[PDB]
Design a protein around this ligand. Structure first.
Ligand SMILES: CC(C)(C)c1cc(=O)[nH]c(SCC(=O)c2ccc(Cl)c(S(N)(=O)=O)c2)n1
Ligand code: NA
Ligand SMILES: [Zn+2]
Length: 257
């Protein structure tokens, strides 16, 4: 039932998932001036050399590219984290227009899209158990701006036509997520939540300072996807982002400057 429309959008989610109004919801506006620099933060460690992509799915909310997380093959560590977190999937949120689409904002600025590389703490054994823990997930958020193409994204954009409607999936092997990373790993970090129901407060958010550039044609193809299932009426998959939520009693830390 939840979705991104007038009748089932972010403003309605609290009725099914009361934690929507909780103490550590995501996303948030990142006020770059009042984020606290912390020289004790470690560089982020992104080890994606052995990543095994498997499949791409349209789940009716976004598309997920999933990875084999049954061994430590693509891991996030270091940065603000004490655990090791295995990459399970990445997905994006995007807008109907280049002027919006990101979930996190930076000094109130919206980006055309936001990538989320979702990782779970190896100490909880699997994704389902990790989401039930305040330190279960580490999500690496990367902003997309529209400009030059990101060559490393194109293999993704080119399969979208095969997963147009809700429920479709396609084989998606040998995709290297290192081709989606900006040059710098400088980051902001804060404790927060999934940005979709069930909105569980289990995420350490690591949002990179440097956006990647993608072309207008690349983002255009995201917007040709559908929220509906095949042979139901066409509802374009656009604006699948949750707006910024109150920061409440949290401090955003910066690894830099
Ligand atoms: C998250 C889970 C429970 C697998 C799920 C359930 C659901 O009903 N709909 C969706 S769609 C969004 C999504 O798959 C997902 C998974 C993990 C994370 Cl951390 C995030 S986010 N948007 O916080 O990064 C989204 N996902
Ligand atoms: Na262009
Ligand atoms: Zn997300």
């Amino acid at each position: 039932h939840w979705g991104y429309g007038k009748h089932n959008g972010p403003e309605h989610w609290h009725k099914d998932f009361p934690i929507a109004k909780g103490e550590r919801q995501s996303p948030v506006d990142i006020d770059t001036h009042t984020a606290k620099y912390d020289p004790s933060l470690k560089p982020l460690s992104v080890s994606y050399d052995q990543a095994t992509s498997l499949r791409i799915l349209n789940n009716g909310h976004a598309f997920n590219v999933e990875f084999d997380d049954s061994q430590d093959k693509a891991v996030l560590k270091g940065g603000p984290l004490d655990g090791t977190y295995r990459l399970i999937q990445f997905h994006f949120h995007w807008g109907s227009l280049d002027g919006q689409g990101s979930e996190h904002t930076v000094d109130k600025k919206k980006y055309a899209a936001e990538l989320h590389l979702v990782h779970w703490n190896t100490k909880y054994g699997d994704f389902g158990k990790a989401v039930q823990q305040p330190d279960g997930l580490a999500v690496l958020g990367i902003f997309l701006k529209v400009g030059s193409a990101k060559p490393g994204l194109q293999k993704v954009v080119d399969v979208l036509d095969s997963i147009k409607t809700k429920g479709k999936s396609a084989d998606f092997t040998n995709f290297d997520p290192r081709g989606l990373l900006p040059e710098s790993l400088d980051y902001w970090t804060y404790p927060g939540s999934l940005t979709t129901p069930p909105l569980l407060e289990c995420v350490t958010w690591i949002v990179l300072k440097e956006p990647i550039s993608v072309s207008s044609e690349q983002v255009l193809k995201f917007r040709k996807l559908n929220f509906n299932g095949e042979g139901e009426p066409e509802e374009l998959m656009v604006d699948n982002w949750r707006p910024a939520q109150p920061l409440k009693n949290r401090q955003i830390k910066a690894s830099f400057k």
